[PDB]
From a paper:
From Actinobacillus OMP100 we derived the constructs A9 with the full IENKADKAD motif and A6 with the shortened motif [name], as well as the ‘control’ construct A7 with the 7-residue motif IENKKAD. The A6 structure follows the same principle: again the first three residues of the insert are in heptad register with the N-terminal [name]-adaptor, constituting positions a, b and c. The other three residues of the insert, KAD, form the β-layer in place of position d. As a consequence, the register of the C-terminal [name]-adaptor is shifted at the junction to the insert, starting with position e instead of position a. This register conflict is resolved further downstream by the formation of a hendecad (highlighted in pink in Figure 3A and C), so that the second half of the C-terminal adaptor retains its original register. In essence, the A6 structure shows a 9-residue element with the same structure as those found in A9 and T99, where the sequence IENKADMKQ borrows the last three residues from the C-terminal CGN4 adaptor and changes the periodicity of the latter at the junction.
α-Helical coiled coils are ubiquitous protein domains, found in a wide range of structural and functional contexts. The structure of coiled coils is understood at a level unrivaled by any other fold. They consist of at least two α-helices, wound into superhelical bundles and held together by a mostly hydrophobic core. The seven positions in a heptad are labeled a – g, where positions a and d are oriented towards the core of the bundle and are thus mostly hydrophobic. We find that they indeed break the α-helices to form short β-strands, which associate into a triangular supersecondary structure we name the β-layer. β-Layers are found, also repetitively, in natural coiled coils, where they form regular fibers with alternating α- and β-structure, a protein fold that has not been described so far.
Numbering used by the authors:
A (entry chain C), B (entry chain A), C (entry chain B): 3 to 63
Write the structure that this text describes.
Amino acid sequence: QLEDKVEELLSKVYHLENEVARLKKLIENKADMKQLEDKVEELLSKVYHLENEVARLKKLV
Amino acid sequence: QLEDKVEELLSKVYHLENEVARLKKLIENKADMKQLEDKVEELLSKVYHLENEVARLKKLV
Amino acid sequence: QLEDKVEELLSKVYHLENEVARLKKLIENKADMKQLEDKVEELLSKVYHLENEVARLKKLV
């Protein structure tokens, strides 16, 4: 019955391999943090400068 | 002592199952890249058009 | 030849441990969804309010 336990572990390993394979695919569809950071910084900067110009225009009208 | 090595692998498999389970939970809390892409594109478009209107308003004042 | 199969599983477990270790590193470089959500909400709000002020300024010029 060590055969019995080795079967058991054979099948657990098989399932783990499939689980890991699918997680790997899930991961590659997730966004990089550096990509979030860079895009948001760019947008934040453009929005900030727009706020200032709008502010200046309010003082002229 | 093949029993000894089969114990060893039993416990490594147990730990792997728990590791994989927790990574699965971590993954489901991460942002999809398509979601980052779509939101940023929308914001980028709105900001671009705002820049143009602000530009036009500067030429009128 | 149960030794033979136990070798086989020993090496599959070894490879899985390395695979899981590297995925764990990949995961920690991905963006949290709540972080995407919060940053985009903030930017969306600022853009919305800019659109309104720009709209109001167009009616004054």
